[PDB]
Each structure stands twice: as structure tokens, then as C-alpha cells.
Amino acid sequence: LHVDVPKDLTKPVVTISDEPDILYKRLSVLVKGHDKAVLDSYEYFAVLAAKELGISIKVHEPPRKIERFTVQYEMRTLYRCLELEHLTGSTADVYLEYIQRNLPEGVAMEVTKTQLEQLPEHIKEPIW
Amino acid sequence: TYTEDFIKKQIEEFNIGKRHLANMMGEDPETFTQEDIDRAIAYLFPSGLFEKRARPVMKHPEQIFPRQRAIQWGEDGRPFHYLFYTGKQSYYSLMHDVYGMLLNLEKHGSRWLIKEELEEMLVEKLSDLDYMQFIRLLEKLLTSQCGAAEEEFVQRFRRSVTLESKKQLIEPVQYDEQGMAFSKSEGKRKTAKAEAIVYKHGSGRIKVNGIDYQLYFPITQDREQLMFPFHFVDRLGKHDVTCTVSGGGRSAQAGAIRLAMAKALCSFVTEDEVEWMRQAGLLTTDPRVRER
Amino acid sequence: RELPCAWKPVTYEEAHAPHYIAHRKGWLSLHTGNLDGEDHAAERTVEDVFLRKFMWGTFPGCLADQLVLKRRGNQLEICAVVLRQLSPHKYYFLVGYSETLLSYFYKCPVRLHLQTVPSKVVYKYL
Amino acid sequence: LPPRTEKMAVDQDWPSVYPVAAPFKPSAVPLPVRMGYPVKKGVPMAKEGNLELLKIPNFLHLTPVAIKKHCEALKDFCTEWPAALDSDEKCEKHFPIEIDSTDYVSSGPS
Amino acid sequence: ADERLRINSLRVKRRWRFRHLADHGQLSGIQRA
RNA sequence: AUAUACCGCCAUCUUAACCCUGAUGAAGGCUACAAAGUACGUUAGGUCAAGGUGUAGCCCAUGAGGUGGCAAGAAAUGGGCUACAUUUUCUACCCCAGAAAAUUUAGC
Ligand SMILES: [Mg+2]
Structure with a gap:
């Protein structure tokens, strides 16, 4: 668009509620695919998005698995693990929505979230 | 068949696509390179096919289409090369040059280029006997007192193979806080991994995981294995050894320690002695391991 | 003929043999069912069978090549390659019809991605 | 009719395309990319009618420019880690309990 | 089922439910070894 | 009962042109230190034990019961399972102690 541009845009309504935010110590994202190049492209995408949102990310590659069965057929499952650390509940929600909506076909995700909680008041002292 | 107009359109299409890809990836089109093209195509079109050629690729059209069809004469029809009518202008021109250089010289590790790669350089198919002719002329040029120009000319047709045996990397001689010189080295045998420190001076004390060597190795065979390195170079009772071994079993640990001590002791012996230990099999990692 | 006298265009998918499926060819359908830990692989296979039969009977003599069935979340994308022999009005009719039937038959948002070609893209001759 | 890549400028806004x-569209992707043994x-086949390029889960919708432009608009939704919790040493101090829970993203109707 | 369950209490590859589809690349992830 | 019904799963087998020579005859064309040569089906197959979709049979019996018996013998060879020790066995230790008593299969 050279001249015809939207004069103003309706930004979505994000409300700062009163309730306190969840805190995640760690957030491990394990993505599984049949293709290593697809997982590498997804890793590049997710890592760049993490940097652009300020999240702290580390990437490693769990060993692959190969299921053979019987003429001999074979199925390779390759893994990529993206460990985010020290992100709140809202950052986690928005980042996960982004990277799950942009999950390529044939790739599955397992997100393990490690929430930080305080002791219940009921356990602070023994009952007398 | 690809007409020159077709190839021209392919070149301009490729340049436009290059600038488009630079646009998409955010890179500067002016400095955008072929390696960048490869990386960007890999990212945008991921493909895990094992066949490297089968993946999507964006090459310059000359890389793709066979462009060996170079015209050998102009519009008037006169051929460019004075040996054109031989049909092997490249090969015979090269032979002529070699013969001329041999005439000039008369008036005054590595391997030979193979037949197929010589064809690739000449861009002309040639038989085996003419390849032999060329190689014998090159041999004659080598035997004569070939100068720097002739030397580089030969090197144009002499491929490189690297031989690097005889050379055991001699570990540096370090000094501990007490001012004593020592050298550290590692060894492996089956699943056993050993790391030994040999001291320049000593009284022949070996200490394995902090235990005397005769207490750590009750069997005489292992003690003989530990003895072999120092005995071979006639320096029993002249060095102290402090080694740490882990994994494996009795004989595997003894072999790992032997290898580590030999590689550490290579620092305190003469180069001739290092070569002798290499030939006695004392500096080689044994690769024999359990097969599935 | 005579007994010792004895002694067809093909596209890429037709040309290459089954043992090239991960070397030169790819997979027509792409989904998570066959991955390790995932479930419902058989249900996806049955869905794929029905889609292929339905599409081959709903676009007769139009499909130049085999379908590509992608799945992202609950989306179901049919990327088909068709010929330029049928009229575009009938193509639009059939796209709408097939999309709606498959959405109501699989309870998911199905969507369809025709790519017309002038004629079969022959790879070689066997 | 002619492909619309002929109308695409060399300095367009790719994310708007x-x-x-979306699946690979050889009439929309202005790249002379080739795929095939x-x-x-011979040569690797062209893109028009190529089923192999159609079978790739392409990332044309996620280019670096697009990713940065998306993550600049998504910053509105984010909150800030409490700076007091600089490392794990204080995370194990102020919040002794840790709760691990997992979600799974597959493809299908259910 | 539940009735029988309670009274008792008182007392080929099927993962896909194949060579055709697997050889024509119609089963995701399946390939020859 | 039938896959001697299909599906599935295994396995068997089969899968030209141009240029010269001979007087322009049938005809012939090589020498490198170079002398014409260059360009899927198949199967009375097995599998109804980690799986299906059908088809047939008997229906005073291929169903349901009752009364007795049945519980073998002998060789030559083929194969399999156990124990078979003094370089052994038991205890302490993990190796300097004390007590007990003919074909065939691999080779690398
Ligand atoms: Mg049978």
C-alpha cells in the first residue's frame, strides 16, 4: 500500500487485572517431528520470538527414536527442547499461543510448566 | 535443449529472485550471497530428505543448466584457436606448451591428476593413451631442473594428499606450585579412561587413585603392563606417576594407564625415543571394542 | 507377437519407487498421529482414505496429481492439483460444496487449496 | 492468466503477501526455487505444478521481518519477572513448592 | 458391559487398523528401512 | 468348513545416423612413435493365537445328556531338556587364605 493506508487501527483490549500473576520458574517445550529441517526452522522461529519478547531461552536436542516394525517399515521421531526460564503467566500465555498457532503440520508439542507456589497457611504451623 | 535466450531469461529471473529473497530475509541485497541463499532456502523451505540434491535449491542458472556449449568460432566462421581443427584444441595446446617448456629446459605426498578430472579441467573428452602421453610429458618436466614457473605449472596438475604420521603431539611440560616439572596425558581402553601425570624427576612411585600400584593391581600381568613403557626407554625408577583411572575392568584399566603414561612420558624423552615408542605400539589407542 | 520377440508418462510421485519416500519423495499426508506418544493414528488413516476417495469422485478427471492432506490443530487443509479443463464456475461450486460437506462430516474447519495446471506435469517416461 | 509475482515489487512488504x-503458491511466491531429483x-523441476514443494511445511509466513513485527505488537500482552528473584537461589527460598503440569498439542478433531 | 463387569467382580498390526498406503506415501511418518 | 472367500501379514517366482574402402559386386573399416572411422503381475502358497468383512454347513443333531471302556508294545535312527568336578566346589574376599572331595558347530 503506497497511499491507501488504514488511518487508525483498533488495538486489542488487554486489561491489567487486580489479581496477582502466576510465576513459572521453567517452561520446557518439547517439539517432536519426522523431519529435522522442519524442527530446525521451528527452533529458529521460536528462539527469535523468545529474544524479541525478552524471554530467556536455551535449546538442546534430545536423542532421536526409531520404531521399526514388519518388508521392514520404520518411523523416526526427532526432538527439539526449548527451555524458557523466569517468565510470568501472561508472558507464557502469549508466547505459547504464538508458537502453538505457528506449529507446523506434522509436529507435536509437549509444554511442561513449573509453577512457583508458596506454602499454604494451613501447613505453616502444627495444629494444637 | 536450452537456447541462449532461455538462459538469459533464467539469469535475469534469478537476479530478481535474489533481490526478492534478500527482501524477505531482511538482509542487504547488495551483499547478499549464495551461502545466504542456501541458508534462507533451507529455513523457508525446510526439507529432511536424505538426498542432498532433492532438497529445494536456488542456484545461479549456469550452475544448473549444462553450459559447456561454448562457441569456438565467430560470425565470420574463423575458429578462435589455432588448433581448432584437431578437435582437441585444449589438450593439444597443453601438450604443445609442455613440449615448448621441455625444449627451453633442454636448451638451459602428492598424486597425479586423474583422467576424469583432467577432462573436467580441459572440458574435453580424452582417451587413456593420450592421458598417459600427457602424464609422461609431465614426468619428464619434473625430472629436469624445473624452475619456479615450471614448478607451479606442474602443481596445477598435481593434487594434494596429506601424510602426517610419525608425529606424536608432545604434551607441554608444566610446573606445579612446588616448582616441579610434570606432564599430563589421557588414555582409553575399552570403557576404561585413565589420566596420568608423569613427573620429570622421581623415584619410580606409581600411585593409582591414591593407592600404590602393587595394591591397586594385585595381578602380575597388569604390573607388567604398567612397567612396559618405562622399561622400554630404560628409565625405570626415574619418574613418579600419579594417575586416575575410571570405568572398565582390570586389564582395560591397566591398558588405559599404560597408554596415558606413555603419552605423558613422550615429553621427557628424545624424539628418536618417541618414534621408537610409536613403533613399539606404545602410543596407539587400541580401537578393538565389543561388536554388537 | 512371438515368444522371444518379447525377450507411458509418469509424474514425480509415480516415477519414484516406495523406498524413496523419505529420500526423494515426501509424505502426502502430514499429521502428528504417527509420532511417538501420539494417539489416533488409525482414525487419521481412515479419514485420509475417505478424503481421497471423496475428492477423486467429486473432481473426476480434474485432479492432475495426488492430494496433499495437511493438519494443524483441528484444521484440515486439502491441497489439490487440478487441470484447467473444467470451468471456473464449476470449480467454485465444487470447492464450496466439498468444504461444507467435509466440515460437517468431520466436525472441523476443513479448507481447500486448488492449484490448476495446464496439463499433467510429466517427470519421465516408464 | 499470468502469475501475479510479475506485479510484485523488489521492495514490497512480504508479510502482507x-x-x-498457507500452502506454497508458485504464482504468489516470487522465487525461482526448484525441487526434485x-x-x-536434467535439472530439478520448476515450481509450477511441483508436488514436492507443495508438500513442504513452508515458513514463508514467518520471516525474520515478520517475526520481529509480530513480537513488537505482542509485547503489550506481557508482564515482568519480579527482579528480586534474580536466580534459582531465591526462587527456592521465597517459593518452596514447585508444581509441574504438562499440556500436549497434537493435530486432530479432539 | 457394566452389569457383566460387576457380577464378574463379585465372582495383524492394529495401530492403523497398509502396504498400499505405506508404499504410496499416504501414511505420515512411515518409510522403508 | 472356507483366507481352495476377500482384506491384512509373511513368503515363492517373472519383469539408429553419418563418413570412407573395394573400379560404386556379394562385402569391409584396426595399429597410440597411431595407417578412416565418429556418434506390477504370480501362487489349488502359509497364517483365524495378539486382526477384520463375508459366505456356506447340521438344526430327532455336526445340539444336550447318561452307562462302561480307552490310559498300547517293540526296535533303529532324527531332534530337544537336565547334571556331567579337581583349570572343580563352599566361605572370606574380589585374585598371596582356609576347608571339601561319526558327522556337526563356529573360525576370518
Ligand atoms: Mg491358502
Whole structure:
């Protein structure tokens, strides 16, 4: 668009509620695919998005698995693990929505979230 | 068949696509390179096919289409090369040059280029006997007192193979806080991994995981294995050894320690002695391991 | 003929043999069912069978090549390659019809991605 | 009719061409990309009608420019880690309990 | 089922439910070894 | 009962042109230190034990019961399972102690 541009845009309504935010110590994202190049492209995408949102990310590659069965057929499952650390509940929600909506076909995700909680008041002292 | 107009359109299409890809990836089109093209195509079109050629690729059209069809004469029809009518202008021109250089010289590790790669350089198919002719002329040029120009000319047709045996990397001689010189080295045998420190001076004390060597190795065979390195170079009772071994079993640990001590002791012996230990099999990692 | 006298265009998918499926060819359908830990692989296979039969009977003599069935979340994308022999009005009719039937038959948002070609893209001759 | 890549400028806004995940369109992607095992004295096939390029889960909708432009608009939704919790040493101090829970993203109707 | 369950209490590859589809690349992830 | 019904799963087998020579005859064309040569089906197959979709049979019996018996013998060879020790066995230790008593299969 050279001249015809939207004069103003309706930004979505994000409300700062009163309730306190969840805190995640760690957030491990394990993505599984049949293709290593697809997982590498997804890793590049997710890592760049993490940097652009300020999240702290580390990437490693769990060993692959190969299921053979019987003429001999074979199925390779390759893994990529993206460990985010020290992100709140809202950052986690928005980042996960982004990277799950942009999950390529044939790739599955397992997100393990490690929430930080305080002791219940009921356990602070023994009952007398 | 690809007409020159077709190839021209392919070149301009490729340049436009290059600038488009630079646009998409955010890179500067002016400095955008072929390696960048490869990386960007890999990212945008991921493909895990094992066949490297089968993946999507964006090459310059000359890389793709066979462009060996170079015209050998102009519009008037006169051929460019004075040996054109031989049909092997490249090969015979090269032979002529070699013969001329041999005439000039008369008036005054590595391997030979193979037949197929010589064809690739000449861009002309040639038989085996003419390849032999060329190689014998090159041999004659080598035997004569070939100068720097002739030397580089030969090197144009002499491929490189690297031989690097005889050379055991001699570990540096370090000094501990007490001012004593020592050298550290590692060894492996089956699943056993050993790391030994040999001291320049000593009284022949070996200490394995902090235990005397005769207490750590009750069997005489292992003690003989530990003895072999120092005995071979006639320096029993002249060095102290402090080694740490882990994994494996009795004989595997003894072999790992032997290898580590030999590689550490290579620092305190003469180069001739290092070569002798290499030939006695004392500096080689044994690769024999359990097969599935 | 005579007994010792004895002694067809093909596209890429037709040309290459089954043992090239991960070397030169790819997979027509792409989904998570066959991955390790995932479930419902058989249900996806049955869905794929029905889609292929339905599409081959709903676009007769139009499909130049085999379908590509992608799945992202609950989306179901049919990327088909068709010929330029049928009229575009009938193509639009059939796209709408097939999309709606498959959405109501699989309870998911199905969507369809025709790519017309002038004629079969022959790879070689066997 | 002619492909619309002929009308695409060399300095266009690519994200507007591929906003969301879409299949490869040889009439929309202005790249002379080729895919296929070449035949003897042949070349990898062109993109028009190529089923192999159609079978790739392409990332044309996620280019670096697009990713940065998305993550600049998504910053509105984010909150800030409490700076007091600089490392794990204080995370194990102020919040002794840790709760691990997992979600799974597959493809299907259910 | 539940009735029988309670009274008792008182007392080929099927993962896909194949060579055709697997050889024509119609089963995702399946390939020859 | 039938896959001697299909499906599935295994396995068997089969899968030209141009240029010269001979007087322009049938005809012939090589020498490198170079002398014409260059360009899927198949199967009375097995599998109804980690799986299906059908088809047939008997229906005073291929169903349901009752009364007795049945519980073998002998060789030559083929194969399999156990124990078979003094370089052994038991205890302490993990190796300097004390007590007990003919074909065939691999080779690398
Ligand atoms: Mg049978």
C-alpha cells in the first residue's frame, strides 16, 4: 500500500487485572517431528520470538527414536527442547499461543510448566 | 535443449529472485550471497530428505543448466584457436606448451591428476593413451631442473594428499606450585579412561587413585603392563606417576594407564625415543571394542 | 507377437519407487498421529482414505496429481492439483460444496487449496 | 492468466503477501526455487505444478521481518519477572513448592 | 458391559487398523528401512 | 468348513545416423612413435493365537445328556531338556587364605 493506508487501527483490549500473576520458574517445550529441517526452522522461529519478547531461552536436542516394525517399515521421531526460564503467566500465555498457532503440520508439542507456589497457611504451623 | 535466450531469461529471473529473497530475509541485497541463499532456502523451505540434491535449491542458472556449449568460432566462421581443427584444441595446446617448456629446459605426498578430472579441467573428452602421453610429458618436466614457473605449472596438475604420521603431539611440560616439572596425558581402553601425570624427576612411585600400584593391581600381568613403557626407554625408577583411572575392568584399566603414561612420558624423552615408542605400539589407542 | 520377440508418462510421485519416500519423495499426508506418544493414528488413516476417495469422485478427471492432506490443530487443509479443463464456475461450486460437506462430516474447519495446471506435469517416461 | 509475482515489487512488504500459514503458491511466491531429483542430463523441476514443494511445511509466513513485527505488537500482552528473584537461589527460598503440569498439542478433531 | 463387569467382580498390526498406503506415501511418518 | 472367500501379514517366482574402402559386386573399416572411422503381475502358497468383512454347513443333531471302556508294545535312527568336578566346589574376599572331595558347530 503506497497511499491507501488504514488511518487508525483498533488495538486489542488487554486489561491489567487486580489479581496477582502466576510465576513459572521453567517452561520446557518439547517439539517432536519426522523431519529435522522442519524442527530446525521451528527452533529458529521460536528462539527469535523468545529474544524479541525478552524471554530467556536455551535449546538442546534430545536423542532421536526409531520404531521399526514388519518388508521392514520404520518411523523416526526427532526432538527439539526449548527451555524458557523466569517468565510470568501472561508472558507464557502469549508466547505459547504464538508458537502453538505457528506449529507446523506434522509436529507435536509437549509444554511442561513449573509453577512457583508458596506454602499454604494451613501447613505453616502444627495444629494444637 | 536450452537456447541462449532461455538462459538469459533464467539469469535475469534469478537476479530478481535474489533481490526478492534478500527482501524477505531482511538482509542487504547488495551483499547478499549464495551461502545466504542456501541458508534462507533451507529455513523457508525446510526439507529432511536424505538426498542432498532433492532438497529445494536456488542456484545461479549456469550452475544448473549444462553450459559447456561454448562457441569456438565467430560470425565470420574463423575458429578462435589455432588448433581448432584437431578437435582437441585444449589438450593439444597443453601438450604443445609442455613440449615448448621441455625444449627451453633442454636448451638451459602428492598424486597425479586423474583422467576424469583432467577432462573436467580441459572440458574435453580424452582417451587413456593420450592421458598417459600427457602424464609422461609431465614426468619428464619434473625430472629436469624445473624452475619456479615450471614448478607451479606442474602443481596445477598435481593434487594434494596429506601424510602426517610419525608425529606424536608432545604434551607441554608444566610446573606445579612446588616448582616441579610434570606432564599430563589421557588414555582409553575399552570403557576404561585413565589420566596420568608423569613427573620429570622421581623415584619410580606409581600411585593409582591414591593407592600404590602393587595394591591397586594385585595381578602380575597388569604390573607388567604398567612397567612396559618405562622399561622400554630404560628409565625405570626415574619418574613418579600419579594417575586416575575410571570405568572398565582390570586389564582395560591397566591398558588405559599404560597408554596415558606413555603419552605423558613422550615429553621427557628424545624424539628418536618417541618414534621408537610409536613403533613399539606404545602410543596407539587400541580401537578393538565389543561388536554388537 | 512371438515368444522371444518379447525377450507411458509418469509424474514425480509415480516415477519414484516406495523406498524413496523419505529420500526423494515426501509424505502426502502430514499429521502428528504417527509420532511417538501420539494417539489416533488409525482414525487419521481412515479419514485420509475417505478424503481421497471423496475428492477423486467429486473432481473426476480434474485432479492432475495426488492430494496433499495437511493438519494443524483441528484444521484440515486439502491441497489439490487440478487441470484447467473444467470451468471456473464449476470449480467454485465444487470447492464450496466439498468444504461444507467435509466440515460437517468431520466436525472441523476443513479448507481447500486448488492449484490448476495446464496439463499433467510429466517427470519421465516408464 | 499470468502469475501475479510479475506485479510484485523488489521492495514490497512480504508479510502482507503471506500473513498466515498457507500452502506454497508458485504464482504468489516470487522465487525461482526448484525441487526434485534431476534425471540424467536434467535439472530439478520448476515450481509450477511441483508436488514436492507443495508438500513442504513452508515458513514463508514467518520471516525474520515478520517475526520481529509480530513480537513488537505482542509485547503489550506481557508482564515482568519480579527482579528480586534474580536466580534459582531465591526462587527456592521465597517459593518452596514447585508444581509441574504438562499440556500436549497434537493435530486432530479432539 | 457394566452389569457383566460387576457380577464378574463379585465372582495383524492394529495401530492403523497398509502396504498400499505405506508404499504410496499416504501414511505420515512411515518409510522403508 | 472356507483366507481352495476377500482384506491384512509373511513368503515363492517373472519383469539408429553419418563418413570412407573395394573400379560404386556379394562385402569391409584396426595399429597410440597411431595407417578412416565418429556418434506390477504370480501362487489349488502359509497364517483365524495378539486382526477384520463375508459366505456356506447340521438344526430327532455336526445340539444336550447318561452307562462302561480307552490310559498300547517293540526296535533303529532324527531332534530337544537336565547334571556331567579337581583349570572343580563352599566361605572370606574380589585374585598371596582356609576347608571339601561319526558327522556337526563356529573360525576370518
Ligand atoms: Mg491358502
